[PDB]
């Protein structure tokens, strides 16, 4: 009987996790739920799974949740604040922790789950994109089990040998027969748009932030960053492949020539159910892949002239966690700028390149150093967007 | 330092296994070589890998090999006969055994390796196609590690969970989260020939015996049989899929929706090296799969009106090892008949159905009962071919 804490339960990934707890009530039990300010959705979840705790961002949303829960007569105890979230991640009798809180908001709660040697269902990029160095040593020390929930990394994790699966981050690839890790991605919506035509792309031609990040492949680039930390891979042990149909979620290359892959439906309940049930399985409620109703599967090399954000993220990794924390930062600014129509689609990659260029800095050293480089690059971007409007 | 005995060393699978030992002389050592009557190739191998023993079919071939090896001054001790082979498979200090002898000739030497609790790199169909029940029980008792070497089964083995990998044949699929096993096959050369047109197919239109079994998919059917025994799967836990490109060698479906597959080049040195290095890896010398230079990947259900030998084999499994031993038997006769031009391509399927129909019998119970059913069906088939010429 696995007992868990879900960080960011009202979100997309949260509801899917609860849908897995819902279908396998025999193996899992929610002990604590942590959400943002969505009091409304939280009441429903607290009333169905009835955790011991519920945490909200502020006391305004907390007092209101206490009230609405009070009505329904729910024993669930309401708290709030980031510290309440960190306490929930470190709860004594809690086994797994869905680190689904995204942004800088999720760094300390995830980190506290880690330091407490919990089984971490890593469901956020900020963790390894900004504090990769810091987070991976924290895991080594507490021997906490990281299990990536994101489609691609989960795929790569299922396709890796068991000794690498139990010592995640601190396992040698080459030593275990792994030649490299094949990180795959759709290539985005403008995969086939002639280069000289990308400048004239609009927010409607890319239907939000995740959709633009897919079109520029900043998303893949950010996943190159995490994969490296997560799988202790070098730049030569990484491959980025364009697989438009996305049935294969990612693969792993071996010494003897074999290539192991994970395939399935886009449904997130699969990778989530995998990490939750690990080293076993449960039903997520996801549809069996119907290999008859599929599009032909194709692959191709990524053209860096078409995806500069990918090359930038790869070079940025080499430059240090200071550079990758700024890449993530500048990109949220620029993507949003392009989305509001202040800059051309092609300016996202070009302004990201600028922010990184027009910015010297020193490697972080704690969640705070990272938070500072973020707000710093956000400022160099917020200002660079203006030099264009 | 793994030490092995290769049964059928001069054959195709034998040379590749020796090529794997040749590139990884640090992990492997040949202790004994067993070949048919190809004295010529054996001398070369005995001279390169200098085993402690070399065995040949007859004394004629053996006295000749003692002479030629005598010339080159090889300390390799030459023996002969089947008993010698069984003794080579059971050698005390031998760790792995490449059961590469095919036909009835390889049933006892493989069985001897098993009874001795050795790690068996299974490289022959007869083993599980005829004596599935007997062999798997022998494994249970001896606790011998079966490692399939054939492309498809190896693929399915690499895609199964570790607890099923270490208890091969006596593991519960469903208990470990396995929904089913996806056995894939090209679909053969006449995959696209309109049905009413298959009767007029010629031996030159299917370029030998393996090529015809591919065209009729009696090969895939035979692989359905072995798979069931090898992975302890029920018919509902089996799926046969036409994958024309054959990059994916086979897959395994899981409870959460995940599908794990093994891809690579058609080279046999890959599965051979996987089983040899297991649970680790080694270089086989095989080319890394170039996902850029591939053909789009497609899949489809098999049409039983197009491949009756597949349905027959699936039905024959239900009918007992007496029926599968007869199917394998009768098909060697019909394929060869078709190959000599005594019958039409479509007659292989029909005469295989007949031999099985016009033949009642009782389940085997030892290697001999099987040899008997084999010889019995060969006679019902050898005679059925005549009723057409
Ligand atoms: Mn992803
Ligand atoms: Mn095969």
From Swiss-Prot, chains A, B:
Cofactor binding notes: Divalent cation. Prefers Mg(2+), Mn(2+) or Co(2+).
MF GO annotations: 1-deoxy-D-xylulose-5-phosphate reductoisomerase activity; identical protein binding; manganese ion binding; NADPH binding
Single GO cellular component term: Dxr protein complex
UniProt cross-references to InterPro entries, sorted A to Z: DXP_reductoisomerase, DXP_reductoisomerase_C, DXP_reductoisomerase_N, DXPR_C, DXPR_C_sf, NAD(P)-bd_dom_sf
Regulation: Inhibited by fosmidomycin.
The EC number(s) this enzyme carries: 1.1.1.267
Chain sites annotated for binding Mn(2+): 150, 152, 223
Alphabetical UniProt keywords: Cobalt, Isoprene biosynthesis, Magnesium, Manganese, Metal-binding, NADP, Oxidoreductase
Keyword Magnesium listed: yes
Protein residues bound to 1-deoxy-D-xylulose 5-phosphate: 125, 151-152, 186, 214, 219-220, 223
Reported pH dependence: Optimum pH is 7.0-8.5.
Annotated effect of mutating residue 153 to Q: Increase in KM for substrate. Reduces activity 35-fold
Record field: catalytic activity: 2-C-methyl-D-erythritol 4-phosphate + NADP(+) = 1-deoxy-D-xylulose 5-phosphate + NADPH + H(+)
Residues where NADPH binds: 10-13, 36-38, 124, 126
Cofactor(s) required for function per UniProt: Mg(2+); Mn(2+); Co(2+)
The organism's place on the tree of life at top rank: Bacteria
GO biological process, one term: isopentenyl diphosphate biosynthetic process, methylerythritol 4-phosphate pathway
HAMAP family hit by this protein: DXP_reductoisom
NCBIfam families: Dxr, PRK05447.1-1, PRK12464.1
Biological function: Catalyzes the NADPH-dependent rearrangement and reduction of 1-deoxy-D-xylulose-5-phosphate (DXP) to 2-C-methyl-D-erythritol 4-phosphate (MEP).
Subunit field text: Homodimer.
Stated name of the protein: 1-deoxy-D-xylulose 5-phosphate reductoisomerase
Organism encoding this protein: Escherichia coli (strain K12)
């Amino acid at each position: 009987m696995k007992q868990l804490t879900i960080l960011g339960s009202t979100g997309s990934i949260g509801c899917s996790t609860l849908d897995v707890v819902r279908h396998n009530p025999e193996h899992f039990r929610v002990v604590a739920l942590v959400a943002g300010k969505n009091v409304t959705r939280m009441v429903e979840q607290c009333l169905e799974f009835s955790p011991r705790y519920a945490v909200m961002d502020d006391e305004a949303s907390a007092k209101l949740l206490k009230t609405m829960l009070q009505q329904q007569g729910s024993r669930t105890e309401v708290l709030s604040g980031q510290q309440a979230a960190c306490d929930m991640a470190a709860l004594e009798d809690v086994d797994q922790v869905m680190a689904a809180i995204v942004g800088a908001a999720g760094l300390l709660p995830t980190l506290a789950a880690i330091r407490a040697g919990k089984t971490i269902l890593l469901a956020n990029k900020e963790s390894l994109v900004t504090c990769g160095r810091l987070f991976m040593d924290a895991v080594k020390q507490s021997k906490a089990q990281l299990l990536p929930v994101d489609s691609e990394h989960n795929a790569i994790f299922q396709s890796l040998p068991q000794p690498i699966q139990h010592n995640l981050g601190y396992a040698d690839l080459e030593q275990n027969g792994v030649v490299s890790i094949l990180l795959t991605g759709s290539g985005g919506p403008f995969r086939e748009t002639p280069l000289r035509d990308l400048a004239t792309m609009t927010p409607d031609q890319a239907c939000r932030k995740i959709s633009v990040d897919s079109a520029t492949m900043m998303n893949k680039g950010l996943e190159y960053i995490e994969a490296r930390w997560l799988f202790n891979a070098s730049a030569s042990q990484m491959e980025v492949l364009i697989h438009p149909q996305s049935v294969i979620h990612s693969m792993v290359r071996y010494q003897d020539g074999s290539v192991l892959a994970q395939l399935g439906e886009p449904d997130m309940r699969t990778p989530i159910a995998h990490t939750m049930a690990w080293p076993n399985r449960v039903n997520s409620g996801v549809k069996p892949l119907d290999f008859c109703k599929l599009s032909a599967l194709t692959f191709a090399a990524p053209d860096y002239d078409r995806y500069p954000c990918l090359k930038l993220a790869m070079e940025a990794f080499e430059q240090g966690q200071a550079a990758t924390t700024a890449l993530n930062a500048a990109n949220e600014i620029t993507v949003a700028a392009f989305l509001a129509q202040q800059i051309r689609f092609t300016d996202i990659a070009a302004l990201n390149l600028s922010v990184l260029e027009k910015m010297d800095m020193r490697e972080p050293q704690c969640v705070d150093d990272v938070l500072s480089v973020d707000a710093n690059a956000r400022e160099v971007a917020r200002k660079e967007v203006m030099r264009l409007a």
